[PDB]
């Protein structure tokens, strides 16, 4: 029956150690295709969610059209969607847990025409990498061959329309199998679904916000916060007279913007707040009046280093069940919500989140790190129960 093959992998651990882990793969003869024109019922028996043939076509994103444009494909007017498992795997291993949960709810739903296909567990749609490659090209090749196979299994009856945002797949792949197109997305819409002009404005919206996307993501590089520096610098910068230093508090209606530096210096921004908490003693320069803001131009500042370093020990909460069952069940990392609006959220690693969702707990802080947007912590001790006065 099955046919063993291998898959190497290059996992990078947190300590900088990579390894060539090798793993398994088992092909099969008959992957169910969850279609109403499969020319043999029994071999798979189609025991799941099953389409009903009324549509004009079938559109398959390659991987990206569901990675970012997903927010389109929920409208209950869209009909006839099939996802290639390789795209699902891409989004899972590339977009965290939120998008994946939305996608999987979409799939796990009897309202739309969404199914999933085992591209990678079928015996002639799988293809191994070759000399000189990339995830993108291998990806599009695999999706293409999957499309061709699905077409020929369909007996060339229902016209598949492979949509891509790749241009070169258009230029090469879409010209050597009658009945299947490789067209861009807006062309898909225009060519087929005019009266869906609502999708047209939202697609133009997300494509203009896309030209932005590369510009905001490539004008960010690989640094999130100004890196600190020694103390003798701050000794001097005080003495020479270019650094004030006082306490720092935050508003609580607006707690991601309105940070004040009690001599009041308006700190605007997280990137300007630079990994620092209330009750702290920070040394600050001034700034030019051409870049001051409104509540008149006030003397905003800039913090480079913290002499004296005042922490505390907060009271937080755990996330909710339907968003823990999706964390896995051995979910090392977790996010915690504090109890006063003045405090950011904290990244800690625990293994009891699914049985403490009706208790207040306590955490601490060890190190604010810049490759994270949050500060790190560790559990400390249990507290009372949410609902009883105690």
């Amino acid at each position: 029956m099955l046919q063993k093959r291998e898959k190497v992998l290059l996992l990078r651990t947190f300590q900088g150690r990579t390894l060539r882990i090798v793993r398994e793969h088992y092909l099969r003869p008959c992957v169910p295709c969850h279609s109403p024109l499969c020319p043999q019922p029994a071999a798979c028996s189609h025991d799941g969610k099953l389409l009903s043939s009324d549509v004009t076509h079938y559109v398959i994103p390659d991987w990206k059209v569901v990675q970012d444009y997903l927010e389109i494909l929920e409208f209950p007017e869209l009909k006839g969607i099939i996802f290639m498992q390789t795209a699902c795997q891409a989004v899972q291993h590339q977009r965290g847990r939120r998008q994946y949960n939305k996608l999987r709810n979409l799939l796990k739903d009897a309202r739309h025409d969404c199914i999933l296909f085992a591209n990678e567990f079928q015996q002639c749609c799988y293809l191994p990498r070759e000399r000189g490659e990339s995830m993108e090209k291998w990806q599009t090749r695999s999706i293409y061959n999957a499309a061709v196979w699905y077409y020929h299994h369909c007996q060339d009856r229902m016209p598949i329309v492979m949509v891509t945002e790749d241009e070169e797949a258009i230029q090469q792949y879409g010209s050597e199998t009658e009945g299947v197109f490789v067209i861009t997305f807006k062309n898909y819409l225009d060519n087929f679904w005019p009266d869906l002009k609502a999708a047209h404005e939202l697609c133009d919206s997300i494509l203009q916000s896309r030209r932005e996307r590369e510009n905001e993501s490539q004008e960010s590089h690989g640094k999130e916060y100004p890196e600190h520096l020694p103390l003798e610098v701050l000794e001097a910068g005080i003495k020479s007279g270019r650094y004030i230093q006082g306490i720092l508090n935050v508003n609580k209606h607006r707690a991601q913007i309105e940070a004040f530096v009690r001599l009041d210096i308006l700190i605007h921004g997280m990137k300007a707040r630079n990994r620092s908490i209330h009750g702290d003693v920070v040394v600050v320069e001034l700034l030019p009046k051409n870049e001051w803001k409104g509540r008149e131009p006030m003397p905003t500042g800039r913090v480079v280093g913290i002499l004296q370093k005042n922490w505390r020990d907060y009271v937080v909460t755990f996330p909710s069940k339907e968003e823990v069952q999706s964390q896995g069940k051995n979910a090392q990392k977790i996010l915690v919500t504090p109890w006063d609006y003045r405090i950011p959220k904290i990244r800690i690693s625990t293994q009891q989140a699914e049985t403490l969702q009706d208790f207040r707990v306590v955490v601490r802080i060890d190190s604010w790190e810049s490759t994270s947007v949050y500060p790190n912590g560790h559990f400390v001790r249990v507290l009372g129960r949410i609902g009883d006065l105690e």
Binding site: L2, K4, L19, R20, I21, V22, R23, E24, H25, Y26, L27, R28, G48, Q92, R104, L107, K108, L116, A118, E120, F121, G328, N330
Partner: protein, 241 residues
Amino acid sequence: LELLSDQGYRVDGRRAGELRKIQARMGVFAQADGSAYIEQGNTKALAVVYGPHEIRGSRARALPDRALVNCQYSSATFSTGERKRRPHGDRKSCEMGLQLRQTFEAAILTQLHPRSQIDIYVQVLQADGGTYAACVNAATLAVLDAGIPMRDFVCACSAGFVDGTALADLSHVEEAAGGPQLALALLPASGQIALLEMDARLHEDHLERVLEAAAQAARDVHTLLDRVVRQHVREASILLG
């Protein structure tokens, strides 16, 4: 991390009650009195046995009623992703050689070689998944190759429990996830169990299904090794004459 998708497929692509592919061999070495070689999935084992002989050392450590089974366990230093070299004093080797000695002091029909030793050696060349069952099957094949009489054909397989279902022939990825693993050593004709092991927590209501699934997966290993033995004996019978 997903260890069981909504469709029912595992990480490597097999269903709940599906085994890996096994590929065995009998008579690998020439100097020794027996040999075997099995690769269960991606785990490569090896076993060498030595026939009943004079007790080494002759330090009056004999048994006047039966034979002396002596089993060892070893592992190559390149058997996993990291080097992880160990000295020959570890208690993992000692516990594996003690479970091996326990199951082979019960499978072998030992009351026919008074004042004799049986030396069994097992070498693991690549460990990925169940090591105990691969060592047991490789040494069962080596003992058959050596001609030592035994009550039955002992075979071992493991199982698991994820999301209210019972797995079979777990792998290293599934093993290193904190689940109720479980392994047997079965005699197919009688249904008796030679060894039982467990770790991690598990409710009392689901023990019957994990144990039943493990026994069934061992009975599925039995047929595949049986066809190998029958083809080997028919091969030698054809060669002889």
